[PDB]
Ligand binder design. Structure first.
Ligand SMILES: [Fe+3]
Ligand SMILES: [Fe+3]
Ligand SMILES: [Fe+3]
Lengths: 172, 172, 172, 172, 172, 172
């Protein structure tokens, strides 16, 4: 065991050791979503960094995790960072959606990982959780909810001017 | 009667609260509209702050009044702030229309009001409006109809692209 | 079903907008008070500015929730705000004795919702209550509730000097 | 009757008079440890300020737990402030093993405090603990339980040198 | 024995260390006074600032003695610290009667401790009081008198419309 | 194909894809290294930084590879980023002998790589890695074998004194 461990349960840190690779993938796809746009025939640069931002801000997410488990007597078990689902993510709107697809997910589990300490009696995990991560996605799911809305009304993916004026007046 | 009372009439006294409560309704629909534009299936953001500046203006109108009754001896008689019947606002263009519409009709109720002060021979209360109001809503319907003019001559409402570009360049 | 909605139960969404109107119930009636002492036959300075203040600090309190609807998938729904029944607040004492009632009503309403917030296991909302609301309406009852012991310790509402003194000096 | 109390069960106030004490039994327990290293026979001063800084946070602890007490109508019944059972804190290693051990037995008293505030429906304190008292001692449990290792890994008490090189590197 | 002990008896070490559970005992009384006017049925919070001010300068004299006790190679022997004798300080004047009463239970203590210094012939322990303690503990008796007198002459306690003028103009 | 491919083979473009992986296999190692050391049963603080910071720095080693592909109109195929070979880096002594074998492997992943641009006559490749990538990692091999020899003189591992001070002095 450890010396700082207290009110910490092995079925809880096991989910923490599960959230860790769950944040690492998002970064890895976000990151795949970045350079997808660096490409010549692709060529929307301001998309990318939006996905490079939230891949970078993604990295501090995965750290704050690692911090608690140490804060709390949990060791750290690392397995593999799987490869993305697609490498060709097609449509300038496909990405925002596929992004939204994965933001819902973290937010789900994060609301599943919340309830676990709701009944193993760990209200400390109900502060660093109820404060540092929820509204993170709630506004991220909120933002990518206005984003996808706009391309569509712009006429995306059938409009090509949609992903230019976006990549300028929303992402500039 | 009070102490500051002079020249003043029960009628115009009575009409201001009619013309006070409605600045709140105005701001309440400006507010109602403002956040309908936050919807995920909207993503019209400078449209939101537009009508949110307007509510905090049409709120100021309600304040830019209530002391005047206490500056002359009349007491305040408010009634129920009723909502609008168009909970959902269809299009920015359409919202401008209703916005315009009410403004146009809040306007006349200020014309109405002036015309009564003119009757009971109250030159001050005519110039409180002179100094503070009719010289303002005139300004409003001008660029209001200007907003139609663009979007209605751009291609909107059936142009979910013109809404995008009307905003990033007119609303801010 | 909005595309930004994940566990936002029907009762909760139908209750966020219940409070909002209640939230806008206060903002209105506070402002009734903010103009009783603007009455000439009343004439107390900073008893209108403390309420003018809240009347906008309740204004803001509502807006933090109309986002939340749109932020959790919820469609805002709007209702009639009713006029205050008290045409007169007698004296500045009973006023705060009516804002204590208010600030107290606002609480069990938060609670009974933060019950249902836990009911449908929406903790996002739960921590949201606790911050801008649970945490503030406590001291907003310690604040307002201190402004009452002294007033009657001074000698209000009988002796009318206490009102002069508390208006200048505590509010200075 | 207490004119501010509201959803504040009486079983919660009794365990706070009992807990404020507990955070004052540790300001004084710090106030011993802060001079045993002052003393010229040990003379570890960067040790001294540590437990003299700690002697101000845990005084700041028991002091916010009392502003709140009047902010919910809870009444403060003080009790005796007993000394500890140990006095010449053998080393610095051991002079921290107690500093930690004595605090773990505050989080536990807080975890059961969050627990008791849960069984009797009080989210204002549960959030109050959530924010002002949860992570802090996780920091402290971190702030101490690690030191212990480095202390141990250099060679204390086998080396009174360590307590010095640790003194003026870790604590300046 | 102490390598640094020189001309320092042991009733000295016993009476210093006897006169530290009297300077501190004052800190604990002022703080209860502080969180008495923190109360909602009292609600005067400059009284409280005051006694939080005596809560801490009379918390710094122990810091003098403890070093002093190690200045002089003596050891520290702590005991319990009682709660003060009242939990409800009755009134605002009467929290000042007693305040002027205890600093006289500590003056003559430190005065009739000033003699044993002369016994063991230890003028260090003499001059150490003739400035750093006794010059400023006969000031704090002087001021409370003016406070108590002002109190009994401003009309305490019969005139409740009074002891709030003192809370504002003198204490603030 | 590519509207910009030039002199840019298949076999060329190959390794880029699989070296991206490697600099991802590495930042993931420094990732865990940094937090093995953040464990209280290790607690060597600024050990964390050194390895954290070189995870943030060998991170950009990949992005700038994943940017070259694009530039020359290459194609990305991000494979899985696997788990670290050891999960308990024993001590600072081992947890650094690893970096050494590691970065030499990464280096020889490029010595034997760069010469592809040589057979395939990729001059833009024969200098980029020279300028942006090679020496930056020779300026990290040295940066470790200067700790590695330090710790063999400071008695590591058998001298657990050696680990504490390298923190504040070399890496503080
Ligand atoms: Fe997150
Ligand atoms: Fe309020
Ligand atoms: Fe409030």
């Amino acid at each position: 065991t450890s010396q700082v461990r207290q009110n910490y349960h092995q079925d809880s840190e096991a989910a923490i050791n599960r959230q860790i690779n769950l944040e690492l993938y998002a970064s890895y796809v976000y990151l795949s979503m970045s350079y997808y746009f660096d490409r010549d025939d692709v060529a929307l640069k301001n998309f990318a960094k939006y996905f490079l931002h939230q891949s970078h801000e993604e990295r501090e997410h995965a750290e704050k995790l690692m911090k608690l488990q140490n804060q709390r007597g949990g060791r750290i078990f690392l397995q593999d960072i799987k490869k993305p689902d697609c490498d060709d993510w097609e449509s300038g709107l496909n990405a925002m959606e596929c992004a939204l697809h994965l933001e819902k997910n973290v937010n789900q589990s994060l609301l599943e990982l919340h309830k676990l300490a709701t009944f193993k009696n760990d209200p400390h995990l109900c502060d660093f959780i109820e404060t540092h991560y929820l509204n993170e996605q709630v506004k991220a799911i909120k933002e990518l909810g206005d984003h996808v809305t706009n391309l569509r009304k712009m006429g995306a993916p059938e409009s090509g001017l949609a992903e230019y004026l976006f990549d300028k007046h929303t992402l500039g």
